[PDB]
């Protein structure tokens, strides 16, 4: 039996992947880059703020000064942080609160493996902080998604091996990070985006302890 679940936040616990997308798209268009559509945004999910901006600049073969890079990243963050102020417990995705309760009842550790610096604030907005045994700080890892470091850190922070853990993710980069950590990935989203080679559920209501159990036994 698995001993921990390692949660991504954005697009898994709540619909904040939508807000990252909207904020990055707005930023890109301000600097004359029009290619950040939903399809391109699949390459941005799960990756750090710096890597997101660089991927956007690369899309247009654009070069900015170091000073401008810092300002642009700050501008997007300030916008994103204003978007999320009204997030509340009502915004928790279906099934997620119940899963957290069921994991705790069964003495399964719960850790956050979000690349987002805004992760702790969002857990507070959603009254979820008390369910988490650990939050892996994305600033403390040497390498960000799709490197496995944040999932390894999350598992270690709750005293469990990655190989005894399940990771929940909505992103290509994050699934790869889970795979390379040794944990078992279960994605949420469209097969057209996350791959046909792992277990994928179409929506978070499918993330039941029953199903994680159904899944684990068969790995
Ligand atoms: O800019 P932040 O809040 O640190 O977020 C970093 C990344 O956090 C991840 O959780 C999101 O999937 C990415 O879209 C985002 O870029
Ligand atoms: Mg995500
Ligand atoms: Na709160």
UniProtKB/Swiss-Prot annotation:
Reactions performed catalytically: beta-D-glucose 1-phosphate = beta-D-glucose 6-phosphate
Residue positions of the active site: 8 (nucleophile), 10 (proton donor/acceptor)
Cofactors that this protein relies on: Mg(2+)
Species this chain originates from: Lactococcus lactis subsp. lactis (strain IL1403) (Streptococcus lactis)
Keyword set, alphabetical order: Carbohydrate metabolism, Cytoplasm, Isomerase, Magnesium, Metal-binding, Phosphoprotein
GO-annotated biological processes: carbohydrate metabolic process
Function text: Catalyzes the interconversion of D-glucose 1-phosphate (G1P) and D-glucose 6-phosphate (G6P), forming beta-D-glucose 1,6-(bis)phosphate (beta-G16P) as an intermediate. The beta-phosphoglucomutase (Beta-PGM) acts on the beta-C(1) anomer of G1P. Glucose or lactose are used in preference to maltose, which is only utilized after glucose or lactose has been exhausted. It plays a key role in the regulation of the flow of carbohydrate intermediates in glycolysis and the formation of the sugar nucleotide UDP-glucose.
Record protein name field: Beta-phosphoglucomutase
Induction cue: By maltose, trehalose and sucrose and repressed by glucose and lactose.
Annotated GO MF terms: beta-phosphoglucomutase activity; magnesium ion binding
PANTHER family: 6-PHOSPHOGLUCONATE PHOSPHATASE, HEXITOL PHOSPHATASE B
Taxonomic classification: Bacteria, Bacillati, Bacillota, Bacilli, Lactobacillales
């Amino acid at each position: 039996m698995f001993k921990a679940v390692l949660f991504d936040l954005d697009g898994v616990i709540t619909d904040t992947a939508e807000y990252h997308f909207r904020a990055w798209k707005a930023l890109a268009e301000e600097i004359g880059i029009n290619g950040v559509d939903r399809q391109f945004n699949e390459q941005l999910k799960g990756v750090s703020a710096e890597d997101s901006l660089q991927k956007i600049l690369d899309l247009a073969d654009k070069k900015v000064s170091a000073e401008e890079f810092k300002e642009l990243a700050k501008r997007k963050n300030d916008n994103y942080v204003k978007m999320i102020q009204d997030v509340s417990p009502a915004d928790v995705y279906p099934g997620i609160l119940q899963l957290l309760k069921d994991l705790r009842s069964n003495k399964i550790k719960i850790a956050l493996a979000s690349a987002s610096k805004n992760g702790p604030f969002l857990l507070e907005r959603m009254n979820l902080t008390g369910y988490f045994d650990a939050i892996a700080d994305p600033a403390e890892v040497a390498a960000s998604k799709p490197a496995p470091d944040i999932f390894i850190a999350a598992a270690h922070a709750v005293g469990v091996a990655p190989s005894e853990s399940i990771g929940l993710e909505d992103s290509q980069a994050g699934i790869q990070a889970i795979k390379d950590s040794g944990a078992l990935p279960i994605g949420v989203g469209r097969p057209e985006d996350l791959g046909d080679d792992i277990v994928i559920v179409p929506d978070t209501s499918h993330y039941t302890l029953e199903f994680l159990k159904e899944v684990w036994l068969q790995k």
